From a paper:
APOBEC3 proteins (A3s) are enzymes that catalyze the deamination of cytidine to uridine in single-stranded DNA (ssDNA) substrates, thus playing a key role in innate antiviral immunity. However, the APOBEC3 family has also been linked to many mutational signatures in cancer cells, which has led to an intense interest to develop inhibitors of A3’s catalytic activity as therapeutics as well as tools to study A3’s biochemistry, structure, and cellular function. Recent studies have shown that ssDNA containing 2′-deoxy-zebularine (dZ-ssDNA) is an inhibitor of A3s such as A3A, A3B, and A3G, although the atomic determinants of this activity have remained unknown.
Given that our structure features the active A3G enzyme, we observed that 2′-deoxy-zebularine was converted to a tetrahedral hydration product; 4-(R)-hydroxy-3,4-dihydro-2′-deoxy-zebularine (dZ-H2O). In this hydration product, the N3 nitrogen of the zebularine nucleobase has become protonated, and a hydroxyl group added to the top face of the C4 carbon. Direct coordination of the C4-OH to the Zn2+ ion is evident by the short Zn2+-O distance (2.01 Å) and continuous electron density around the Zn coordination sites. This provides direct structural evidence of the second step of the deamination mechanism, whereby the Zn-coordinated hydroxide has attacked the top face of the 2′-deoxy-zebularine C4 carbon, forming a tetrahedral transition state intermediate. In addition, the Zn2+ ion is pulled down ~0.8 Å from the inactive A3G-CTD2*:ssDNA structure. The A3G-CTD2:dZ-ssDNA structure provides clear structural evidence for the activation of dZ to a transition state analog and explains the stronger binding affinity and inhibitory activity seen for catalytically active A3 enzymes.
Author numbering: 194 to 383
The structure:
DNA sequence: AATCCAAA
């Protein structure tokens, strides 16, 4: 569908750091082009997707959300001599292998600046932290989603049918706690 | 310290 189901958004983007039950990953994406040295939104280069679940018929191995996203890029036919900024709002941050693949992509495509804004930090059984450091070293700008970013995703990706964004309890404090943890990760204190 | 991360 054109827009994301609102219950799906609210469940998957909740940012309580240690909450259980989120065994899918959702990713909303938007692209801007640098023109007259301003970032200008490419209206048709935006959307959302989820991971292909493990054991789903026709894709029994599954495919993580970040890989489905990278798959859609060549079909955009981005112009080789223009600078782009690609922003991904992710419900879980990249696992180690996804982080390595996104780092490979940005290493091969230097005209693309990747920003990852995540609701929660995916631990990947202790392996994700090194992957996030590797992705940052390759040039990605990784941050924790804040209130205004959740509201932007509600307003522009969700099938809200006119309902306003309703923040869940503790949103801001969760964002700020996760931001401290991400800072510790990226500077190798964790 | 560990939480948390499809699989019961
Ligand atoms: Zn992954």
């Amino acid at each position: 569908r054109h827009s994301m189901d609102p219950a799906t958004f609210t469940f998957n983007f909740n940012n309580e750091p240690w909450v259980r039950g989120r065994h899918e990953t959702y990713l909303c994406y938007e692209v801007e082009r640098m023109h007259n040295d301003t970032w200008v939104k490419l209206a048709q280069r935006r959307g959302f997707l989820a991971n292909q679940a493990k054991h789903k018929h026709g894709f029994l191995e599954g495919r993580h959300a970040e890989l489905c996203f990278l798959d859609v890029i060549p079909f955009w036919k981005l112009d080789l001599d223009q600078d782009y900024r690609v922003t991904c709002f992710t419900s879980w941050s990249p696992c180690f292998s996804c982080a390595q693949e996104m780092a490979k992509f940005i290493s091969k495509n230097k005209h693309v600046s990747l920003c990852i804004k995540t609701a929660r930090i995916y631990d990947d059984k202790g392996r994700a932290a090194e992957g996030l450091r590797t992705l940052a070293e390759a040039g990605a700008k990784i941050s924790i989603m804040t209130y205004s970013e959740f509201k932007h995703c509600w307003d522009t990706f969700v099938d809200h049918q006119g309902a306003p964004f309703q923040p869940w309890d503790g949103l801001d404090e969760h964002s700020q706690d996760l931001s401290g943890r991400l800072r510790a990760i990226l500077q190798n204190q964790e």
